[PDB]
Amino acid sequence: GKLQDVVNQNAQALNTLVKQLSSNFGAISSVLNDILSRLDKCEAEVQIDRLITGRLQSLQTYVTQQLIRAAEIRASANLAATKMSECVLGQSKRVDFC
Amino acid sequence: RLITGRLQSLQTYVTQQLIRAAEIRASANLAATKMSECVLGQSKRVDFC
Amino acid sequence: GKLQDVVNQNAQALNTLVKQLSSNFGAISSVLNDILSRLDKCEAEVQID
Amino acid sequence: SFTVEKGIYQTSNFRVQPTESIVRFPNITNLCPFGEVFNATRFASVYAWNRKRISNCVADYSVLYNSASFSTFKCYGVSPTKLNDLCFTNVYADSFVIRGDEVRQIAPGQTGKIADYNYKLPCDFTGCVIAWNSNNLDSKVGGNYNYLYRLFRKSNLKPFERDISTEIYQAGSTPCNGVEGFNCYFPLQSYGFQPTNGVGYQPYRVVVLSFELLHAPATVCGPKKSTNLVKNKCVNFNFNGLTGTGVLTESNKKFLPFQQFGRDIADTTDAVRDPQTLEILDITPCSFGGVSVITPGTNTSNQVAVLYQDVNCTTWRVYSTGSNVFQTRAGCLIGAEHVNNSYECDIPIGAGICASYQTSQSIIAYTMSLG
Amino acid sequence: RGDEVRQIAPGQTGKIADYNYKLPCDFTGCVIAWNSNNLDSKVGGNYNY
Amino acid sequence: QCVNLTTRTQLPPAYTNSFTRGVYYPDKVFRSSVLHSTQDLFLPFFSNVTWFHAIHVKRFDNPVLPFNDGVYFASTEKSNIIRGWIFGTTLDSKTQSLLIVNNATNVVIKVCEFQFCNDPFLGVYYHKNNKSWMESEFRVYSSANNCTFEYVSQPFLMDLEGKQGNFKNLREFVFKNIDGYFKIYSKHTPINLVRDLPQGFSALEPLVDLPIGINITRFQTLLALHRSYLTPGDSSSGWTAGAAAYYVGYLQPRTFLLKYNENGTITDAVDCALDPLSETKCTLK
Ligand SMILES: C=CC1=C(C)/C(=C/c2[nH]c(/C=C3N=C(/C=C4\NC(=O)C(C)=C4C=C)C(C)=C\3CCC(=O)O)c(CCC(=O)O)c2C)NC1=O
Ligand SMILES: *[C@@H]1O[C@H](CO)[C@@H](O[C@@H]2O[C@H](CO)[C@@H](O)[C@H](O)[C@H]2NC(C)=O)[C@H](O)[C@H]1NC(C)=O
Ligand SMILES: *[C@@H]1O[C@H](CO)[C@@H](O[C@@H]2O[C@H](CO)[C@@H](O)[C@H](O)[C@H]2NC(C)=O)[C@H](O)[C@H]1NC(C)=O
Ligand SMILES: CCCCC/C=C\C/C=C/CCCCCCCC(=O)O
Ligand SMILES: CCCCC/C=C\C/C=C/CCCCCCCC(=O)O
Ligand SMILES: *[C@@H]1O[C@H](CO)[C@@H](O)[C@H](O)[C@H]1NC(C)=O
Ligand SMILES: *[C@@H]1O[C@H](CO)[C@@H](O)[C@H](O)[C@H]1NC(C)=O
Ligand SMILES: *[C@@H]1O[C@H](CO)[C@@H](O)[C@H](O)[C@H]1NC(C)=O
Ligand SMILES: *[C@@H]1O[C@H](CO)[C@@H](O)[C@H](O)[C@H]1NC(C)=O
Ligand SMILES: *[C@@H]1O[C@H](CO)[C@@H](O)[C@H](O)[C@H]1NC(C)=O
Ligand SMILES: *[C@@H]1O[C@H](CO)[C@@H](O)[C@H](O)[C@H]1NC(C)=O
Ligand SMILES: *[C@@H]1O[C@H](CO)[C@@H](O)[C@H](O)[C@H]1NC(C)=O
Ligand SMILES: *[C@@H]1O[C@H](CO)[C@@H](O)[C@H](O)[C@H]1NC(C)=O
Ligand SMILES: *[C@@H]1O[C@H](CO)[C@@H](O)[C@H](O)[C@H]1NC(C)=O
Ligand SMILES: *[C@@H]1O[C@H](CO)[C@@H](O)[C@H](O)[C@H]1NC(C)=O
């Protein structure tokens, strides 16, 4: 389960990113085409500005969460490399390390 | 606008909490290693304990 | 390189922070002076917010 | 920057531009009843306003330019300039006559006797409000006392509510017992419209067109001319005023009779019922697949290989086939020569494939040696 | 005419806003209109406009 | 021509549980294989709904009931006894009122200043010479003036024979008066059940959207009387009621998690804020 958690977390993060495209973020609609079809170029820019800001914020949140998860995985991989060096390539005197 | 701002505030709080959780997890991993290697045994590592 | 990267990233980060001042964020301009000179205090407050 | 260091860089996904545009509107030829709605010899009183259904027609609205001239024309929820490009689902014209000073009250979120007791508009109101002076039609010498308005009511009306009752309004505390008198007024009062009258206290004819956009089947359309339907090609489409870009393909979905568009988890339109032929078409974006650029230093050379992930090279979705097309396990690599040898990784393509710049001089791709 | 003064503005439709005079709404500038009766109107009709 | 009906036997109002019933399509957009969360005027799950009978064995109930933000009206029938509704505030010609009626030939919808009678009903007469049934009485309203909205459907002829056995048709309706629009969602299912509302889930589809523009606070069902030689006396007592039943519940603003299957049908739903487990399900989507 410890690896299935990694796989599920990545898949769920991407699925959440896809799901978050349905938010208005204050705009009249969450769909670019609806805004561009009912509004002229004039205020369609204002609405698309709100949409762009919201979706960029969604991407930034996703990337920050991924950075934290990658830091966790880096710690785990450093531990794995240490165990490889000290228990596969040697015999560890450390208690309960292996 | 209020909802957007307050949701951003909550997201900032949660991100800071994740960072501090990572720090505390590092500290707790160190503490568990020390419990295993110094309480449950004798450590030859210099200045570890 | 591991040390040089640690320098470069920080500098790069700081440089990015300057460049991101050139964004409207929905305002009519990315410059406070332009907004305050074209718009009075009335709606320049909204834009500056 | 003008210099690119050695490595592999992710570029934008593969893009396909639309080859042609298509417009698909419902097949209808009748003109909308502009004559009956605007050129009406008899408008209704504001307290009892006339609602008329408009359906199965074309909203050209350039026939009004010859004769009509509207004092106010304010559209909410839609730009005036897009009205020629849209289709409207269920269209109602609410017609009445009011005072010239009260035309400002026909708008969302207003107060006053007309906005409160006679005719109320919502704020989720997609529509248009049209008002024009009719002093030469609705006013006559000595006063036209045929147009009435409700002056007293116990509570404000709900949006799009009508109240044609004529019960005596009990302003005071004593019961009225259905007879006028002290603190017992007849709720309705008649406008006095005359030709020698101030512009603010002159008759104005008001038509409120209420409709919806891009959510249900539409029988009222703009004057846009339809076009043949082309499938399996990235195209710009305009389906009942819903614009977009993508590939249209046959669909197995079975829409209910009351449905026109299908939507996915992201609320984008995934399917659409073709208005001309009652068939369902799936809409799919034509941009898809990742593209990476493998380059040595730009000083070293301007040659670059392109790794098109998720395309099979064994008509392709590539920018230029060129030569040296090799199907790696990480995608299709174009511009790099495959070599049977193996060396240490220099530019990791992925999936155990690496690339380098070697000797005349060209980019080679190989399977990395572990040791 | 008076009824068409509303059409001299960004994002408008009608005779004037489609066939005679069109504005953007990236339109920095401004519109001034004043009633010209008893200056451009004469008995029997002024058909020069 | 209206006549009050006196040969009644008063009983307490019966009550029933609505087992995940009264869900309708919130909008006209096709959705398939998704868990869509929507907030609207829904009938709460496992809510208590009033129960009205029409039987002889004589008990029949057509009281004037409130109309609180919308109504869910289910009817279990086998002989077409319940054939319309009246909506309004005073129902006395001082205000406008809505009449929906299926008079065995057409479906008539009318927003009109009706002077409704205390006991409005339709009446089908049994014929002994020829075993044929046809509507003979229409005692809904005595007057109609200033008669704004009118719609009449195409002619038809439905089987109004009084059947003996088990209820066959379940007809579910959702009425709501929003922004001057009377929205009716409808569903019809075949069943074989004696007394209560059937279990299961069935999603009501948009039937019609009438621009009545009327204030509505009360409504009353219009039942059809069987008249035959077996029942003597005047019109106020010479009648009998065919076996039928209906159930009335009230919509409230609720958030639901609807499940659209691969074919675009709402197969099931979860009523958020019913109990904490439902809240958990809605949160997890
Ligand atoms: C009261 C207004 C009323 C409504 C809203 C209504 C809806 C309605 N009922 C229908 C079927 C039908 N409707 C009825 C009769 C009724 N069904 C009911 O909900 C009620 C109350 C009756 C009257 C007692 C019958 C018998 C059928 C056909 C059932 C069948 O043969 O399968 C249809 C389909 C008609 C078609 O095929 O074109 C509609 C739209 N019918 C009405 O009369
Ligand atoms: C719609 O009808 C109801 C009932 O007639 C109105 O509610 C009444 O309003 C009066 C005065 O406002 C009160 O004295 C009554 O107590 C109310 N009765 C009930 C049951 O609510 C309501 O005002 C009407 N709504 C509109 C917009 O006219
Ligand atoms: C059911 O209602 C409809 C409409 O009220 C009736 O149809 C009308 O009947 C009268 C007879 O006097 C005609 O004058 C009208 O022209 C009819 N209008 C229509 C068909 O739209 C119908 O007769 C009623 N049927 C029963 C059995 O009562
Ligand atoms: C006697 C001085 C007035 C003091 C009022 C103080 C607070 C209320 C502000 C009320 C708005 C002005 C009311 C006039 C508009 C009502 C008529 C209409 O719009 O149709
Ligand atoms: C018969 C009513 C049909 C209404 C058509 C339905 C929806 C579209 C509304 C379109 C424009 C309505 C008329 C515009 C009048 C202003 C013309 C002008 O600016 O000079
Ligand atoms: C006219 O409308 C009908 C609606 O089904 C459609 O079948 C037909 O193709 C349309 N005419 C043309 C030339 O497309
Ligand atoms: C409206 O009425 C005037 C005069 O009756 C007429 O000149 C004009 O053609 C009419 N316009 C339309 C669209 O019917
Ligand atoms: C490219 O290589 C040359 C050496 O021939 C060097 O002078 C140059 O600095 C290199 N380009 C960059 C951007 O460093
Ligand atoms: C598609 O790519 C895979 C390798 O990723 C390959 O095995 C397969 O043969 C390709 N399809 C065809 C028809 O060759
Ligand atoms: C690589 O090896 C294969 C045999 O496995 C051979 O068919 C092919 O010609 C060789 N290609 C090169 C460039 O040496
Ligand atoms: C009985 O019928 C008459 C008219 O026929 C009606 O006026 C009266 O209200 C009815 N009785 C009651 C208690 O309503
Ligand atoms: C309706 O059902 C609930 C629970 O069964 C009960 O508490 C309530 O009393 C019932 N309503 C009435 C009026 O009894
Ligand atoms: C048949 O039914 C009709 C319905 O009223 C009735 O008038 C007629 O009398 C019946 N036929 C005979 C022969 O009685
Ligand atoms: C309502 O009815 C009365 C009499 O039938 C009539 O005097 C009045 O004009 C009518 N009002 C409306 C709006 O129809
Ligand atoms: C969905 O529609 C298809 C018809 O192609 C049918 O075979 C299938 O049974 C349906 N499945 C459900 C769950 O309705």
Coordinates of N, CA and C in Angstrom, one line a residue, chain A residues 9-85:
Chain A
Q9 N -2.0 9.0 -5.2 CA -1.9 10.5 -5.0 C -1.6 11.2 -6.2
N10 N -0.7 10.7 -7.1 CA -0.4 11.4 -8.3 C -1.7 11.4 -9.2
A11 N -2.3 10.3 -9.4 CA -3.5 10.2 -10.2 C -4.6 11.1 -9.7
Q12 N -4.8 11.1 -8.4 CA -5.9 12.0 -7.8 C -5.5 13.4 -8.0
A13 N -4.3 13.8 -7.9 CA -3.9 15.2 -8.1 C -4.2 15.6 -9.5
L14 N -3.9 14.8 -10.5 CA -4.2 15.2 -11.9 C -5.7 15.2 -12.1
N15 N -6.4 14.2 -11.6 CA -7.9 14.3 -11.8 C -8.5 15.5 -11.1
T16 N -8.0 15.9 -9.9 CA -8.5 17.1 -9.3 C -8.2 18.3 -10.1
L17 N -7.0 18.4 -10.8 CA -6.7 19.5 -11.7 C -7.7 19.5 -12.8
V18 N -8.0 18.4 -13.4 CA -9.0 18.3 -14.5 C -10.4 18.8 -13.9
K19 N -10.8 18.3 -12.7 CA -12.1 18.7 -12.2 C -12.2 20.2 -11.9
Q20 N -11.1 20.8 -11.5 CA -11.2 22.2 -11.1 C -11.4 23.2 -12.3
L21 N -11.5 22.7 -13.5 CA -11.8 23.5 -14.7 C -13.2 23.9 -14.8
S22 N -14.1 23.4 -13.9 CA -15.5 23.7 -13.9 C -15.9 24.9 -13.0
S23 N -14.9 25.6 -12.4 CA -15.2 26.8 -11.6 C -15.3 28.0 -12.4
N24 N -16.3 28.9 -12.0 CA -16.4 30.2 -12.6 C -15.3 31.1 -12.3
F25 N -14.8 31.1 -11.0 CA -13.8 32.0 -10.5 C -14.3 33.5 -10.6
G26 N -15.6 33.7 -10.5 CA -16.2 35.0 -10.6 C -16.7 35.3 -12.0
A27 N -16.2 34.7 -13.0 CA -16.7 34.9 -14.3 C -18.1 34.5 -14.5
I28 N -18.7 35.0 -15.6 CA -20.1 34.6 -15.9 C -20.3 33.1 -16.2
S29 N -19.2 32.5 -16.6 CA -19.3 31.0 -16.9 C -17.9 30.5 -16.8
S30 N -17.8 29.1 -16.7 CA -16.6 28.4 -16.6 C -16.1 27.9 -18.0
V31 N -16.7 28.3 -19.1 CA -16.4 27.8 -20.4 C -16.0 29.0 -21.2
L32 N -14.8 28.9 -21.9 CA -14.3 30.0 -22.7 C -15.3 30.2 -23.9
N33 N -15.8 29.2 -24.5 CA -16.6 29.3 -25.7 C -18.0 30.0 -25.4
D34 N -18.6 29.7 -24.3 CA -19.8 30.4 -23.9 C -19.6 31.9 -23.8
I35 N -18.5 32.3 -23.1 CA -18.2 33.7 -22.9 C -17.9 34.3 -24.2
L36 N -17.2 33.7 -25.1 CA -16.8 34.3 -26.3 C -18.0 34.3 -27.3
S37 N -19.0 33.5 -27.1 CA -20.2 33.5 -28.0 C -21.2 34.4 -27.6
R38 N -21.4 34.7 -26.3 CA -22.5 35.6 -25.8 C -21.9 37.0 -25.6
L39 N -20.6 37.2 -25.3 CA -20.0 38.5 -25.1 C -19.1 38.8 -26.3
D40 N -19.0 40.1 -26.7 CA -18.1 40.5 -27.7 C -16.7 40.4 -27.1
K41 N -15.7 40.8 -27.9 CA -14.3 40.9 -27.5 C -14.1 41.8 -26.3
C42 N -15.0 42.7 -26.1 CA -14.8 43.8 -25.1 C -14.7 43.4 -23.7
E43 N -15.8 42.8 -23.2 CA -15.8 42.3 -21.8 C -15.5 40.8 -21.7
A44 N -15.5 40.1 -22.8 CA -14.9 38.8 -22.9 C -13.5 38.8 -22.3
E45 N -12.8 39.8 -22.6 CA -11.4 39.9 -22.1 C -11.4 40.0 -20.5
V46 N -12.4 40.7 -20.0 CA -12.5 40.8 -18.5 C -12.8 39.5 -17.9
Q47 N -13.8 38.8 -18.5 CA -14.1 37.5 -18.0 C -13.0 36.5 -18.1
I48 N -12.4 36.5 -19.3 CA -11.3 35.5 -19.5 C -10.1 35.8 -18.6
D49 N -9.9 37.1 -18.2 CA -8.9 37.5 -17.3 C -9.2 36.8 -15.9
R50 N -10.4 36.8 -15.5 CA -10.8 36.1 -14.2 C -10.5 34.6 -14.4
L51 N -10.9 34.0 -15.5 CA -10.7 32.6 -15.7 C -9.2 32.3 -15.7
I52 N -8.4 33.1 -16.4 CA -7.0 32.8 -16.5 C -6.4 32.9 -15.1
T53 N -6.7 33.9 -14.3 CA -6.2 34.0 -12.9 C -6.5 32.8 -12.1
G54 N -7.8 32.4 -12.2 CA -8.2 31.2 -11.4 C -7.5 30.0 -11.8
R55 N -7.4 29.7 -13.1 CA -6.8 28.5 -13.5 C -5.3 28.5 -13.3
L56 N -4.6 29.6 -13.4 CA -3.2 29.7 -13.1 C -3.0 29.5 -11.6
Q57 N -3.9 30.0 -10.7 CA -3.9 29.7 -9.3 C -4.0 28.2 -9.0
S58 N -4.9 27.5 -9.8 CA -5.1 26.1 -9.6 C -3.8 25.3 -10.0
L59 N -3.2 25.7 -11.1 CA -1.9 25.1 -11.5 C -0.8 25.3 -10.4
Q60 N -0.8 26.5 -9.9 CA 0.2 26.8 -8.9 C 0.0 26.0 -7.6
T61 N -1.2 25.8 -7.2 CA -1.5 25.0 -6.0 C -1.1 23.5 -6.3
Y62 N -1.4 23.0 -7.5 CA -1.0 21.7 -7.9 C 0.6 21.5 -7.8
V63 N 1.3 22.5 -8.4 CA 2.7 22.4 -8.4 C 3.3 22.5 -7.0
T64 N 2.8 23.3 -6.2 CA 3.2 23.4 -4.8 C 3.0 22.1 -4.1
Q65 N 1.9 21.5 -4.2 CA 1.6 20.2 -3.6 C 2.6 19.1 -4.1
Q66 N 2.8 19.2 -5.5 CA 3.8 18.2 -6.1 C 5.2 18.4 -5.5
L67 N 5.6 19.7 -5.3 CA 6.9 20.0 -4.7 C 7.0 19.4 -3.3
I68 N 6.0 19.5 -2.5 CA 6.1 19.0 -1.2 C 6.1 17.4 -1.2
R69 N 5.3 16.8 -2.1 CA 5.3 15.4 -2.2 C 6.7 14.9 -2.7
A70 N 7.3 15.7 -3.7 CA 8.6 15.3 -4.2 C 9.7 15.4 -3.1
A71 N 9.5 16.4 -2.2 CA 10.5 16.4 -1.1 C 10.3 15.2 -0.2
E72 N 9.1 14.8 0.1 CA 8.9 13.5 0.8 C 9.5 12.3 0.1
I73 N 9.3 12.2 -1.2 CA 9.8 11.1 -1.9 C 11.4 11.2 -2.0
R74 N 11.9 12.4 -2.0 CA 13.4 12.5 -2.0 C 13.9 12.0 -0.6
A75 N 13.3 12.3 0.5 CA 13.7 11.8 1.8 C 13.6 10.3 1.8
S76 N 12.5 9.7 1.3 CA 12.4 8.3 1.2 C 13.5 7.6 0.4
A77 N 13.8 8.3 -0.8 CA 14.8 7.7 -1.7 C 16.2 7.8 -1.1
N78 N 16.5 8.9 -0.4 CA 17.7 9.0 0.3 C 17.9 7.9 1.4
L79 N 16.8 7.6 2.1 CA 16.8 6.5 3.0 C 17.0 5.2 2.3
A80 N 16.4 5.0 1.1 CA 16.5 3.7 0.4 C 18.0 3.6 -0.1
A81 N 18.6 4.7 -0.6 CA 20.0 4.6 -1.0 C 20.9 4.3 0.2
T82 N 20.6 4.9 1.4 CA 21.4 4.5 2.5 C 21.3 3.1 2.9
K83 N 20.0 2.5 2.9 CA 19.8 1.1 3.2 C 20.5 0.2 2.2
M84 N 20.5 0.6 0.9 CA 21.2 -0.2 -0.2 C 22.7 -0.2 0.2
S85 N 23.2 0.9 0.5 CA 24.7 1.0 0.8 C 25.1 0.2 2.0

